[PDB]
Design a binder for these strands. Structure first.
Lengths: 128, 128
DNA sequence: CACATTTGAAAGGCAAATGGAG
DNA sequence: CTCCATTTGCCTTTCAAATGTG
């Protein structure tokens, strides 16, 4: 709705006038509010490329920062490790908890990360 | 050449292992070597997209940082200011230094930023 | 100045993490 | 757990802001 898209528009203006980059914001946002956001989120926000609900929930967080102004970190799966996981995935798309423990161990990755990786991978497989 | 990439593909590894993002290295580099470096660069480095000569330059200070660890800020431009600048460019594409100072003062931009804007805008016109 | 190159803010693709229901 | 949807960010890439050359 308008009451939402407008703010996005106003925000970018002030942000820019304030000398800040979507990055600068998302970073001071984490200190000034404890949370933590990425340049990608802020960009996505000033652009209404967030869900109506994501936008909604986010707007206030920003309303505070502008006025003032005026979650596990994403694991990076390295090539070597993906190749191993794709392979293991072609062998078995649904390894069990333990098979997951062996895979995690064998790779020196946290059981949980591995568990999610497989789940995401099946989800991937399901799209086409 | 090969002598080079071998620091590229290496650095990435060392980076990722050390627990750092291209952006993290950017932030870091901005303090230590006290120079100026954006994630787009660090990405371009590791990906070897940096022009021969250039790539060659960078390497050393990254190497410096890595081993150690082991310019004017780009002015962003409001849509509106831009539609104004653009409107102005249609009226006269080569404003005089005084007309520039006037425009800068009106929009609340640096005289230089505005001079450049018009030269780039002229260049952009020369590419078709 | 014109023109060529460098370099970064912002945006897009792919997926890691999270959350609701069975 | 899972499945499936959704949030969220790392890394990449576009366009132009900035620098460099003649």
């Amino acid at each position: 709705l308008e009451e939402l898209e407008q703010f996005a528009k106003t925000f970018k203006q002030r942000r820019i006038k304030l000398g800040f980059t979507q990055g600068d914001v998302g970073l001071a946002m984490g200190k000034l509010y404890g949370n933590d956001f990425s340049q990608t989120t802020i960009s996505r926000f000033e652009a209404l490329n967030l869900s109506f609900k994501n936008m909604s929930k986010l707007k206030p967080l920003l309303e505070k920062w502008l006025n003032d102004a005026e979650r596990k970190k994403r694991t990076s799966i390295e090539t070597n490790i993906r190749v191993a996981l794709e392979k293991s995935f072609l062998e078995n798309q649904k390894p069990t908890s333990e098979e997951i423990t062996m895979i995690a161990d064998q790779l020196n990755m946290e059981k949980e990360v591995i568990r999610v990786w497989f789940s995401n991978r099946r989800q991937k497989e399901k799209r086409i």
